[PDB]
Paper text:
OxyR, one of the major ROS-sensing and -responding systems identified 35 years ago in enteric bacteria Escherichia coli and Salmonella enterica serovar Typhimurium (S. Typhi), is an LysR-type transcriptional regulator (LTTR) that is characterized by having an N-terminal DNA-binding domain (DBD) and a C-terminal regulatory domain (RD). As best illustrated in E. coli, OxyR (EcOxyR) becomes activated when a disulfide bond is formed between two conserved cysteine residues located in the RD as a result of oxidization by H2O2 (6–7). Most OxyRs belong to the dual-control (type II) group, acting as not only an activator of peroxide‐scavenging enzymes under oxidative stress conditions but also a repressor of the same target genes under nonstress conditions. In this study, we attempted to unravel mechanisms for functional irreplaceability by carrying out comparative analyses of type I EcOxyR and type II OxyR of Shewanella oneidensis, a representative of a large group of Gram-negative facultative Gammaproteobacteria renowned for their respiratory versatility and the potential application in biogeochemical circulation of minerals and bioelectricity.
To better understand why EcOxyR cannot function as a replacement of SoOxyR, we determined the crystal structure of the RDC203S of SoOxyR, which should be locked in the reduced form with a single point mutation C203S, as the mutant could no longer form the disulfide bond C203-C212. The crystal structure of RDC203S of SoOxyR was solved to a resolution of 2.4 Å by molecular replacement. The RDC203S of SoOxyR polypeptide chain, which contains residues 91 to 304 of the full-length protein, was traced unambiguously except for the last four residues at the C terminus and a six-residue loop from amino acids (aa) 179 to aa184 that were structurally disordered. Each RDC203S molecule is made of six α-helices and eight β-strands that fold into two domains, RD-I (residues 91 to 164 and 274 to 304) and RD-II (residues 165 to 273). As expected for a reduced form, the disulfide residue pair C203S and C212 in SoOxyR RD are found at the opposite ends of the helix α7, with the −OH and the −SH side chain measured to be 13 Å apart from each other. There are six SoOxyR RDC203S molecules in each crystallographic asymmetric unit. Through interface-I, RDC203S monomers assemble into dimers with an average buried surface area of 1,268 Å2. The second-largest interface (i.e., interface II), which buried a surface area of 561 Å2 on average, further assembles RDC203S dimers into tetramers or dimers of dimers. Interface II is mediated by α10 located at the very C-terminal end of the protein. α10 from two neighboring subunits pack against each other in an antiparallel manner, forming an interface that is largely hydrophobic in nature.
Author numbering:
A (entry chain A): 91 to 175, 178 to 299
B (entry chain C): 91 to 179, 185 to 298
The structure:
């Protein structure tokens, strides 16, 4: 029964595009009798889906509200800020130097907006472009068009989201500028061995 | 004032990462006094925002429900089926079950690819229910199935640093139309036609 059967897995669109294929291919090779029924959605709808019984496991970015659930941290990944290679000004980043609507952020339903704001210490909301984005690939294209800057997760950079771009990587304002990756499941699960195995595989996948 | 002032423009996630940056770049170079207040969202939510006044202009497809609005077609982009480089060889029902990767019905590209490629067998669809074509590209590059892709994604380099090859899907009209949608009672007729010509030249 462990590592066998149908498991309905949820993963947020800031994690799934550059982790999920390696998660699924390894489980196909090592556990071919386990069928992962995936779903890509944002955090609140994913936790709700776990509440209704729609899903059994969620791959989330950890600092969210997981009340009534069990949550296991499986890794960290830092934040970076990207600019076209031609406006590199100063490495210790002052947010007040930047022009007015020049920091692109996803719609606030994506947890990466709040995580990047709190972790990289963005205090001036006037610095935030009024783009209501949903894809970080769109923002990478916007920054590559010299239209501003954005925060990128490290796991996006390591999978070549900056390929075919003139973007460069900077270190954001410090004081723990990272994001926790974690696994979420119901407290009444009967598949704790499977979820701990998936967590160990994901943690090892987060190099 | 044509190309001056605030314009609230919405774009679907299956078009935006391949055209929106170039649209905004050319607009702020040729018309620097027009501010594009942008939004990425799916077709029904963009239509709801257009009807309630939250947005003024939408970049969508043509074959969606645009009752009570004005649609202008600005071009086409073909549908192409992409597969891993090792896995190759009119594309009939040879494919196994749960193999075609499709986005949720929330995104119009699913219905567009289904109707334009004559996909009548749902059993060949993998039950992913995705939202991002880049995730599906990563899944196909891991030898996990097929997916449909718009030509504008391939032109923007979505197959770069992958091992995917392009195949012609079995459709009589294997393409998707692109269009601009706005309220019929608008006064910015010249601005919207200008942006439509701009997008049409870009496509």
């Amino acid at each position: 029964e462990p590592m066998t059967g149908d498991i309905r897995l949820g993963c947020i669109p800031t994690i799934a595009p550059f982790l999920l294929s390696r998660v699924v291919k390894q489980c196909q090779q090592a556990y071919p009798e386990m069928s992962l029924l995936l779903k890509e959605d944002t955090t609140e709808r994913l936790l709700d889906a776990l509440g209704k019984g729609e899903l059994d496991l969620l791959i989330l970015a950890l600092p969210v509200d997981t009340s009534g659930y069990h949550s296991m941290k499986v890794g960290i990944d830092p934040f970076k800020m990207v600019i076209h290679k031609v406006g590199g000004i100063h490495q210790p980043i002052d947010y007040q130097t930047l022009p007015d609507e020049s920091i692109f952020l996803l719609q606030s339903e994506h947890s990466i907006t709040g995580h990047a704001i709190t972790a990289c210490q963005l205090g001036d909301s006037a610095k935030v472009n009024p783009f209501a984005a949903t894809s970080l690939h769109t923002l990478v294209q916007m920054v590559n068009s010299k239209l501003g800057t954005t925060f990128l997760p490290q796991m996006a950079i390591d999978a070549g989201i900056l390929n075919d771009t003139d973007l460069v990587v900077m270190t954001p304002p410090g004081e723990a500028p990272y994001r926790d990756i974690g696994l979420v499941w119901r407290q009444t699960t009967s598949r704790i061995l499977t979820f701990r195995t998936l967590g160990l595989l994901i943690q090892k996948l987060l190099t």
